Amino acid sequence: AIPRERVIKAVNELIKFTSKPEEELKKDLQLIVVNNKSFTGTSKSFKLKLLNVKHSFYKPWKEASATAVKDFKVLLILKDSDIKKVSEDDLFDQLDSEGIKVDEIICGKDLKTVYKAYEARNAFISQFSLILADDSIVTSLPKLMGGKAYNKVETTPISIRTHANKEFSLTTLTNNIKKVYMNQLPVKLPRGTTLNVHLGNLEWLRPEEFVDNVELISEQLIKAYQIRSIFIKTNRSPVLPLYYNQ
Amino acid sequence: IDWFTRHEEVMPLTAVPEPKRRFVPSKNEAKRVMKIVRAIREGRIIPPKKLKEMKEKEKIENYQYDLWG
Amino acid sequence: EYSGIIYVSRLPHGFHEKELSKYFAQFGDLKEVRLARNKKTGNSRHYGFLEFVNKEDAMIAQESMNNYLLMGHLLQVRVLPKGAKIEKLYKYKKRKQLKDNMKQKHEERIKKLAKS
Amino acid sequence: KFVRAESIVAKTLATSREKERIKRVSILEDKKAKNETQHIASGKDFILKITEGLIREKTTYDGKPALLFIVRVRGPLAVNIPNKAFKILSLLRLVETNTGVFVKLTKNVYPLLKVIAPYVVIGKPSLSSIRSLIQKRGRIIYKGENEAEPHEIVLNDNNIVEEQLGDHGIICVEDIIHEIATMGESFSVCNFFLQPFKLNREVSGFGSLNRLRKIKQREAESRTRQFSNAATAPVIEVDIDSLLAKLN
Amino acid sequence: GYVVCDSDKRFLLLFSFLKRNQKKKIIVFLSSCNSVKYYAELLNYIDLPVLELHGKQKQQKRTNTFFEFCNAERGILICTDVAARGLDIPAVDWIIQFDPPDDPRDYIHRVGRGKSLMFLTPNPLNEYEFPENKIANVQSQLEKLIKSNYYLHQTAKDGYRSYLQAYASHSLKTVYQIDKLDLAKVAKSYGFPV
Amino acid sequence: RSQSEREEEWLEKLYKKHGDDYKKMFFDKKLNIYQQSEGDLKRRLLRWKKRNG
Amino acid sequence: KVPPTIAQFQYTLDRNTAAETFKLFNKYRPETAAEKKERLTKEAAAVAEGASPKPYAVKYGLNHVVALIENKKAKLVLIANDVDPIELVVFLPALCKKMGVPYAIVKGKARLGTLVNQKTSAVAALTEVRAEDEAALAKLVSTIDANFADKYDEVKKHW
RNA sequence: CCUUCUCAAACAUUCUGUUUGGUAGUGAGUGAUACUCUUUGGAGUUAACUUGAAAUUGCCUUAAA
DSSP: OOHHHHHHHHHHHHHHHHHOOOOHHHHHHHEEEESOOOOOTTEEEEEEOOOOSSOOSSHHHHHHHHHSSSOOOOOEOOOOHHHHHHOHHHHHHHHHTTTTTEEEEEEEHHHHSOOHHHHHHHHHHHOEEEEEEEHHTTTTTTHHHHGGGSSSSSSSSOOOOOOOOSSSOOOHHHHHHHHHHHHHEEEEEEESEEEEEEEEEEESOOHHHHHHHHHHHHHHHHHTTTOOOEEEETTTTOOOEEEEEO | TTTTSSOOOOOOOOOHHHHHHHHSSOOHHHHHHHHHHHHHHHTSSOOHHEEEEEEHTTTSSSSSSSSSO | OOOEEEEEOOOSSOHHHHHHHTTEEEEEETEEEOOOSSSSSSSSOOOEEEEEEEEHHHHHHHHHTTTOTTTTTOOOOEEEEEOOHHHHHHOOOOOOOHHHHHHHHHHHHHHHHHOO | OOOOOHHHHHHHHHHEEEEEEHHHHHHHHHHTTTTTOOSOOOSSOEEEEEEEEEEEEEEEESOOOOOEEEOOOSTTOOOOHHHHHHHHHHHHTTTTSSSSEEEEOOOTTTHHHTTTTTEEEEEOHHHHHHHHHHHSSOOOOOOOOOSSOOOOOOOSSHHHHHTTTTTTSSSSSHHHHHHHTTTTTTHHHHHTOOOOBBOOOOOOOHHHHHHHHHHHHHHHHHOOOOOOTTOOOOOOOHHHHHHHHHHH | BBBOOTTTHHHHHHHHHHHHHHSEEEEEEOOTTTHHHHHHHHHHHHTEEEEOTTTTOOOOHHHHHHHHTTTSSSOOOEEEETTTTTTSSSSSSSSEEOOSSSSTTTTTTTTTEEEEEEOOOOOOOBBOOGGGGGGOOOOHHHHHHHHHHHHHHHHHHHHHHHHHHHHHHHHOOSSSOOSSSHHHHHHHHOSSOO | OOOOOOHHHHHHHHHTTTOOOOHHHHHHHSSSSSSOOOOEEEEEEHHHHHHOO | OOOTTTSSSSOOOOHHHHHHHHHHHHTTTOOOHHHHHHHHHHHHHHHHTTOOOOOOOOOOHHHHHHHHHTTTTOSSEEEEEEOOSGGGTHHHHHHHHHHHHEEEESSSSHHHHHTTTTOOEEEEEEEOGGGHHHHHHHHHHHHHIIIIITTTTTGSOOO
């Protein structure tokens, strides 16, 4: 386990480096780079490790996207069974009770007929930020929503359990979407050794809370993976050695 | 020599306002339904689901009657 | 003037040298065909060259396929000027001793915050 | 005759689905048989039934040997079958469309059954459908007068039954039906004795009604047969009994 | 002092500069009192809390609601050149004029009491930069929206008919009807320029 | 002269949803389908409030 | 001898482009008299006991099309060459060229009639489209402008 | 003128949780310092952005006639 105090000396000296006399991303993007003796080297996965986080950075990301130029929007990809079954009003009635809001639910059909053009698909996908996807069709998507949409960590979808033991229920999705939203952070898995965790918005993450997020991630990485070196980095800063495995 | 048409046009040739009839869903069909509502209110017309039920009882009872006595 | 090598461009996704050789055999005897692919992954950059042995037969094809709409997007095709041969479109497909240096590199790296 | 450029790409891209489709299945059941589950989709045998409101009762498959009758269908549109499916359809000699055969379903048979699923339709038949198939269609490749055997002609007799098989107790054509409906030991010999069943095609013509009945029935295949294209695609079973009324 | 932009994205740039700047008392100056019906009606319907001042409304209706801005802290009003003349609030920092003003000569004189920029394709202070791929992609949202309500279609129309009349009824030799109408319709987002 | 059954039932939907916010009522899409003005909707509601509450 | 505005027809759209035009246009059939009637009886049976967006179709009246070009609302316009009074449609390719609306002379008037629930149509146009076929429509616009317009720029000349 | 892997398991149930496994891409181009590796050959990687589906060459048969 890592000390809390090196991370505090890591984050606040980057608060120094961000307080200097593109800028929407360079100042704002807290990311942390993780190295391994060969992450998943031989197979090109696209899963997102949903790292459990104590305090959300998405309800944070909810606000500052209204003050900044780009609207943070949430997608749900469903199969055919549910879209004929469920409306946004049922989602809105049981998620605004928190205050989270699904903007658009999209069938598997709609990815292949009404956004099949590469131009319109890039126009459709690049708007959204939280791409969620129901599990039945999660495994069909890189034919559907393109390869360009999997270059990011936003636009790559998240598999989410919507079936209450083999049958769909709305109750199952409604508390699970909150589970991914406020408690979870994605990170992808390249078959390289380098991996970053784009932790999020530097305008948010009051840096005592931010250290709580960083240390909790380092728990779920060292247990799940062998690791070599860990670095925190505001976007192309000097890299800061936080943890040093051998 | 395609002389006048080489200078390609910009605004349409009119300036007429476009009516509200080209937006909210159309009166004509809405009037026509209301008449077919009226006729089934008077019962001149059967709905198509019961016409299958008129054809379900019918058309199986075929060749099922006495012809000599 | 015009020469024998052709510039078939704007090719549909899923249309390779074989089908390029097969379909353009229909016009006559065809010299040699490639298609330009990405080196890293064996997929096409959607423009390719072929040559007929008859310089007559080339501009037959160009006057038949210059704007020929083909499953999504029309093929743009070009005869070429004299010389300027087909060249180089290879058929690509989908292709504690350390601990000494990392102990060196962990200590070297701390100088950088002191640098800035 | 001349080939339009529309064709050769559509044929390319459809088979290069099937070249990708069976590759994944051939990798999977390799890892199912060799038992190296670290990353698989599913870990068991799936057989789904589609009958009638359009029910989809997915089932498991135990080791219990069952009897399947398989009809060759001509699907899909632009698919030159690859080498891996030329073989199975030739080993079942289902190379003619609208031709059927009974086979036995084991756990040796089921993995190869996921190969040919888009090219045929399968299912469990009934005894009536067992019986009314054979005594109404039946070919026997047997010697003619002296030279010409391959007149396959007809299950005319019960003493031709004495002739070729005979010594396995195979005495009459009704006795053959005992060897198929019940898994007998000489089941494969009598299965090798009745080589096709030349079923008729349903639409069977051009014309006024025939164009329409073709169109109305062609969409009916698109509901009663779905093409899963999945790694752990189920094997889809239809009712044979209602199908043979359409085919006899 | 100014921002050089083409007529397509003039409005689209403005919606960017409003959303990024949502804390400051800022004023836009537009020409027609008919027009700021339009740009007010969008922004309350694409959900920016804007304010609206124009000749086509009553006096104390104009005044008491203008009074709300003057005692405010955060928001934004849209007004004409004419109705805001003589009544400058010192509590302001951004004066962005979208149009060439009514009097171009006497316009500089009304500054000096408030930072300024304008918008011009062919037509003291400096300019600003703009990174071109940052403008909001609401034109997809708007074109559906300009076709769906007819009230918003009518007010788009009057916001266009009255925009160009005022553009012709102006002083300067520069600002005289050279501009192509394919792109000013896109500032109000049409397929065809009415 | 009275109002039709559909018209009355449609006005019930509008009144229970908004109340007396005619601006919201005409910018509404789901209930007010035919994009009628403020003056049209309020007039018909006044007639509705005479026969009913 | 033919005066250039006549025999601006007969230099029609070719085999493959015409096939692809109908591949688009046959998607956008007007709802036929029988289909429309049964839909309204479905509406009668449903709405009397216990929402829809504007549906796209081809536009097919000569007056309606001559309205739509110069409105401007038309995107693609198909024009039959065989017309009993030819003078009915001779101005129409020039009108499209002047207003900048992409047009194509199709071959066969009954061929237009098939897609439109009529005997003959003389002119057919597609004003608006569903989102999925938008890119396909605009591609066909470029396909027609390359094949029809750019090849026959000299169609305004030569007797 | 083809139309694309629409869920498997395990444990625990509250009317669904927990856990594991399953996804091999249109192309081109720009580009922010870092990570590993072996060996100077470059390999695998790590923000972000552009683009009409763009482009001028890296060594089976009745879907018959």
